[PDB]
From a paper:
To resolve the HsFuzzy-Inturned-Rab23 complex, we again used a nucleotide-free mutant of the GTPase (Rab23N121I) and performed coexpression in insect cells. Fuzzy and Mon1 fulfill homologous functions and contribute most of the interface with Rab23 (885 Å2) and Ypt7 (1270 Å2), respectively. When bound to its GEF, K39 and Y38 of Rab23 adopt the same conformation as the corresponding residues of Ypt7. The guanine base stabilizing aromatic residue F34 of Rab23 is removed from the binding pocket, but in contrast to F33 of Ypt7, it does not bind to a hydrophobic pocket on the GEF surface. Instead, residues I33 and T35 interact with Inturned and thus fix the switch 1 conformation. A double mutant Rab23I33A/T35A showed increased intrinsic nucleotide exchange but reduced stimulation of nucleotide exchange by Fuzzy-Inturned.
The tri-longin domain (TLD) RabGEF complexes represent a family of RabGEFs with a unique conserved structural core. We here report the cryo-EM structures of the Mon1-Ccz1 and Inturned-Fuzzy core complexes bound to their cognate GTPases Ypt7 and Rab23 in the nucleotide exchange transition states, revealing a conserved catalytic mechanism with distinct modes of substrate recognition.
Numbering used by the authors:
A (entry chain B): 302 to 447, 456 to 495, 511 to 552, 556 to 569, 586 to 608, 622 to 648, 797 to 822, 827 to 857, ...
B (entry chain C): 5 to 122, 129 to 178
C (entry chain A): 8 to 251, 261 to 342, 362 to 418
């Protein structure tokens, strides 16, 4: 809720000024209300903790937990040169691994917005839109319920995995979509593009290092609804972890979301609108595809390409409402167990995990990792009749 | 080792360069960048006083009013205190009385002493306050590198006298 | 595996000692006052602002604070690979329970002076750095007594009852290597921290024929100085007797042979040659209603060497099992993707008798729950 403590803030380390007011070390803090003043006070604890753990441990502070008013609040860190970004959310609403994933995603999004996040927070003209974005951030983290409630329930897990909800496609539909997107590629050059349908990614040529940024930016603004109009013509400069300008276009029409990245060194909108109009003949086919073993649910994920496959809303329509949310909630902890070995592998560059549930009807919620083949993760709920 | 572990609490104004003299005294552990966020800096310097390897837990306090109530938490249990002030600075000259009354009202009556480091003020007035509040003034400079370890040795000797007094 | 335990006086701020067991071995490492002062200061900053700073995790290590009562705090640094918060919190609770066991609530709350407090706690490190270093028991982490089932003989309990009646005490316990072999009902009904502290305390104590030490019961008698008499009649075997050479020969003389059977039974828990699946390389069981723990590491020692490794995997797995659990089960297969490599860890809760298992990778993944149910059915008649 709104009254529940939460904060996002951007302190400056190595304070070298004679003044010691709040604005001296706080570059930007949200929310500026009664839900964050206490953490605004404990900011000094946060700074001392970061500096101390820098001195004693060679690594950065991953996170911390603080018992406020009888409930534990998790705070996640990130230390840059002279700046420390820091977020804080309740544990009962946001578990710690989820909090770390949200912090890394939000920092990637901010770097996608305006260069390094130092230039994101240092400026003042971006304060109102930063407040708007963080209001969306907190309202999504705390009040996801805003086709009903199924996406919100699945969120608590789906945001954790990289990628988008990839929709399995026939050969002909994929081929014609690829041809249309290549025709769209044909002042600026096109790095690539990606088409999403009703919140489901339908076809991508963009490299994953920018596709992930596209996905997280679109999601942070609730641009991927389910069973959702106008002409979204988003046209803005972005900085996708890569000098020259790296502009971005996002065109929306009748459940079609085409995101195309442009390099540098209505002109580019008319042809994409015509492409969407001519592709409007495949919406019926893609809807037919969207419509229509003891395996109940699977969130099979790929890493190198960067996509995950989940059953469609129609598939989950046919104890199931409890099943999905319990499965996602437990897969969050299984995700934590797996990110332990994932960061171990990243250092190099464990095998699986299983669970019973009887909140009824066995469950065998099983997470599996594949590192010897192309890295990927699988998460399955199924009955215990056959294993 | 059986260290006595006497706790210094040092109170000044934050703009008198007390951090400089304390860093000059004890090397290694500094933790200098915490007075602006929490309000106290923690330092240590073991010193050989009268056959005793006395451990000195120095707790520098932030002179800014931003950290005052929290500062009151660090005074309690401190085995001795030190009031620093500068001959050049004026505010600390009258702030020493406030610091003394606060430090004695927080934890209690302690065998402490003050120190003037590194003019706008006269030595006679400093002696006046010193004789007024039972402690002796010390003439200290950032360049002489003296009249400070004697301060700490004297305070440690006072605490050692206290401990050997009530141990029996 | 660097680990530092710092005990601080919350009211004053002066640390009590810097006990640390870096690298498992009892290294006499002195943590510089920089970090001690800084952690104490952040703790008082939180306490003043009515916000309890519990823990802070970094990529390498993990630090944790907590405040017992009002005047005592304990903080830990720990760089061991595979650390979770709950292990550290149980360690904190157990060290505080040990403190109140050895010095009592008096001189721990309402401290007249902390110098004599540290001088008194000088007689208390040994159990603490036994805790912090590598240990053969997990009773600290699970808060359950590391009981070992006797060789299916009521003669042990009868002899213990006779000894208790002779000595006029209801708190008597036969313990081997810190593992509770037998005890009267009063010892079973003992409070949660000291029930596991006392056998551990004696295990950490130097081996002597007879010893008399004063303790305080964290449950029941936090202030009453109960005297504990420890008698080591046999190597690694000990008898504890609590009170608020003709001492054992009239009861324990005919039981010398079973006690001989208990000399190797300590490290090798469970009845000797118990019928168990040969793929199990380490067993760990809990009885939550009775708070009784059974932790054995050598059911099959030829494969997967370094039993301390098995102990650490079982402890970490228990931490994750408590994280998820708190007709349910969970398993974790670790190691390389190559078949025949790695280990399996299984856990099953049935009838408030949560049980853990460590297995060779050849064990059937599909039958892991079946094997756990079989082990639970084989172990339920034991206790």
């Amino acid at each position: 809720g709104l009254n529940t403590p939460h904060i996002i803030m951007y302190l400056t380390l190595q304070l070298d000024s004679e003044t010691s007011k709040e604005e001296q070390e706080i570059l930007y803090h949200y929310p500026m209300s009664e839900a964050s003043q206490k953490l605004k006070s404990v900011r000094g604890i946060f700074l001392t903790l970061c500096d101390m753990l820098e001195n004693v441990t060679g690594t950065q502070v991953t996170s911390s937990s603080l018992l406020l008013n009888g409930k534990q609040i998790h705070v996640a860190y990130w230390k840059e040169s002279d700046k420390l970004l820091l977020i804080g959310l309740p544990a009962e609403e946001v578990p710690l691994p989820r909090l770390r994933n949200m912090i890394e995603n939000v920092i990637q999004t901010l770097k996608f917005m305006y260069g390094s996040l130092d230039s994101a927070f240092c400026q003042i003209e971006n304060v109102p839109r930063l407040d708007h974005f963080f209001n969306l951030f907190f309202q999504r983290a705390l009040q996801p319920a805003k086709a009903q409630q199924y996406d919100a329930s699945s969120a608590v897990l789906l945001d954790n995995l990289p990628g988008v909800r990839w929709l399995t496609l026939p050969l002909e539909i994929k081929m014609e979509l690829d041809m249309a997107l290549s025709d769209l590629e044909a002042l600026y050059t096109i790095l690539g593009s990606s088409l999403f349908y009703k919140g489901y990614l339908i076809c991508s040529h963009l490299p994953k290092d920018d596709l992930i940024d596209i996905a997280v930016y679109c999601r942070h603004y609730c641009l991927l609804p389910l069973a959702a109009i106008g002409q979204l013509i988003i046209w803005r400069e972005v900085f996708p972890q890569h000098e020259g300008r790296y502009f971005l276009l996002v065109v929306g029409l009748k459940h079609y979301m085409l995101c195309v990245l442009l390099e540098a060194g209505c002109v580019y909108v008319d042809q994409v609108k015509t492409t969407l109009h001519q592709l409007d003949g495949v919406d019926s086919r893609i809807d037919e595809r969207l419509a229509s073993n003891t395996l109940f649910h699977y969130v099979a994920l790929e890493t190198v390409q960067g996509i995950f496959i989940t059953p469609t809303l129609e598939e989950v329509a046919q104890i199931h409402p409890q099943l999905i949310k319990n499965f996602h909630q437990c897969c969050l902890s299984i995700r934590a167990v797996f990110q332990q070995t994932l960061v171990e592998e990243k250092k190099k560059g464990v095998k699986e995990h299983g669970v019973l549930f009887e909140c009824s009807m066995a469950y065998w919620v099983v997470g599996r990792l594949f590192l010897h083949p192309k890295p990927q993760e699988l998460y399955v709920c199924f009955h215990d009749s056959v294993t | 080792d059986m260290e006595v572990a006497i706790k210094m609490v040092v109170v000044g104004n934050g703009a008198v360069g007390k951090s400089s003299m304390i860093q000059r005294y004890c090397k290694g552990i500094f933790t200098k960048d915490y007075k602006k966020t929490i309000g106290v800096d923690f330092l240590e310097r073991q010193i050989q006083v009268n056959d005793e390897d006395v451990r000195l837990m120095l707790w520098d306090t932030a002179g800014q009013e931003e950290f005052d109530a929290i500062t009151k938490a660090y005074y309690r249990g401190a085995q001795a205190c030190v009031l620093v002030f500068s001959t050049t600075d004026r505010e600390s000259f009258e702030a020493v009385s406030s610091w003394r009354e606060k430090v004695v009202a927080e934890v209690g009556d302690i065998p402490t002493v003050l120190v003037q480091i590194k003019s706008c003020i006269k030595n006679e007035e400093a002696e006046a306050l010193a004789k007024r509040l039972k402690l002796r003034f010390y003439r200290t400079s950032v360049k002489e590198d003296l009249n400070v370890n004697e301060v700490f040795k004297y305070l440690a000797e006072k605490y050692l006298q206290k401990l050997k007094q009530q141990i029996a | 595996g660097t680990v530092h335990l710092l005990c601080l006086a919350a009211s004053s701020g002066v640390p009590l000692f810097c006990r640390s067991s870096r690298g498992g071995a009892p290294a006499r490492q002195q943590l510089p006052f920089s970090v001690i002062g800084s952690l104490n200061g952040v703790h008082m900053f939180g306490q003043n602002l009515e916000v309890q700073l519990s823990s802070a995790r970094t990529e390498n290590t993990t630090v944790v604070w907590k405040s017992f009562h009002d005047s005592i705090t304990l903080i830990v640094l720990s760089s061991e690979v595979g650390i979770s918060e709950l292990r550290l919190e149980r360690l904190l609770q157990m060290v505080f329970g040990a403190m109140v066991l050895l010095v009592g609530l008096e001189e721990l709350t309402n401290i007249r002076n902390v110098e004599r407090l540290k001088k008194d706690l000088r007689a208390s490190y040994c159990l603490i750095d036994s805790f912090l270093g590598d240990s053969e028991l997990i009773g600290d982490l699970t808060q359950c007594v590391d009981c070992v089932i006797p060789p299916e003989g009521s003669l042990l309990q009868e002899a213990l009852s006779g000894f208790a009646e002779a000595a006029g005490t209801t708190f008597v316990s036969l313990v081997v290597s810190g593992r509770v072999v037998a005890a009267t009902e009063g010892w079973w009904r003992l409070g949660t921290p000291e029930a596991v502290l006392l056998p551990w305390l004696v295990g950490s104590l130097p081996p002597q024929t007879a010893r008399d030490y004063p303790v305080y019961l964290p449950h029941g008698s936090p202030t009453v100085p109960h005297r504990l008499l420890t008698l080591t009649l046999l190597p690694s075997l000990e008898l504890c007797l609590l009170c608020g050479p003709q001492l054992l020969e009239r009861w324990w003389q005919p039981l010398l042979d079973p006690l001989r059977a208990c000399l190797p039974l300590g490290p090798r828990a469970l009845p000797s040659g118990f019928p168990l699946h040969t793929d199990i390389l380490g067993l760990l069981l809990l009885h939550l209603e009775l708070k009784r723990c059974l932790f054995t590491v050598e059911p099959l020692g030829d494969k997967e060497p370094s039993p301390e490794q098995r102990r650490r995997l079982l402890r970490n797995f228990y931490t994750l099992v408590t994280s998820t659990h708190f007709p349910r089960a969970c398993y974790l297969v670790l190691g390389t993707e190559e078949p025949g490599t790695g280990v399996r860890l299984v856990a099953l809760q049935l009838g408030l008798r949560r049980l853990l298992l460590l297995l060779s990778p050849q064990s059937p993944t599909h039958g892991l729950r079946s094997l756990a149910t079989h082990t639970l059915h084989a172990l339920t008649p034991l206790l």
